[PDB]
Amino acid sequence: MSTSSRGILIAGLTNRARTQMAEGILRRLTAGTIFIKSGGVHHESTIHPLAVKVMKDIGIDISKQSVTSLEAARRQQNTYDVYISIDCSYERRTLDKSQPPRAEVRRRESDPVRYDPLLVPRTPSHWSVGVDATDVRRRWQIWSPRDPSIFHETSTRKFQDHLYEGEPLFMQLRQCPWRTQAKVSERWEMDEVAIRYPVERHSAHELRFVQAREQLLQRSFDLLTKLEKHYGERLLLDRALLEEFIS
């Protein structure tokens, strides 16, 4: 039967490793009955060759998939029902994208410096996520110096003063505060796996894809169980992957 779900968006920053594995897992468990669109912000990449091999160990072939942005789906943001943001945690996030991640803030229970859980609260889970880092969109602008309003020497359409006029094709990022308009909105915190650290073996870099695979198997099982109580239908049609996951 045609399902009542209008679509599933898997938002990311690069659409390279984690969102490609999440599209492959969610398509198998729903048996292709639900439209699933996985996209990112920076589309200038290919699917990682370890992301295809690790998914091939289960039997999922994501080699037919492709890296694509969500720019076609930002105009149709109100038409999709489910919105998933797969991004790294803000305590472990690094902006250079060339180092291993930092250590999170540790709290006391019942040598890293542990904090008090009453003095340092832990961002309680009943709150919602308004905008994520995956909720941006690209904005291309060009200020050409052949426009006589920009070529004039007293003009604010330049990012300098005395060097030149205009600016050739600069890119800025907007915000998309429409993830709360979706019916089901979740955020999945997973570490980065698409960038290899300073010196690290191929067996150790592949192991991070295996650990990111088991987290995506658990989170997709919790997502589809929530959506089965939301719509009221059966969305875990193929349970051949879950019997290896439960056992």
Binding site: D111, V113, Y115, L119
Partner: protein
């Protein structure tokens, strides 16, 4: 909040570097230590008021 921060600062290896904006004051005298050329003590063209 002071002791936990000072222990975390002493265990951290990155923020143990010296900071010239925080560690010291470079100069506290009212006059600079070397001559920058100024003043001129003379007039120029179009200046009638001298001194």
């Amino acid at each position: 909040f002071r002791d936990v921060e000072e222990r975390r600062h002493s265990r951290d290896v990155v923020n143990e570097l010296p900071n010239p904006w925080y560690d010291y004051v470079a100069h506290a005298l009212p006059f600079p230590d070397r001559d920058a050329g100024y003043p001129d003590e003379y007039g120029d063209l179009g200046q009638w008021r001298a001194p």
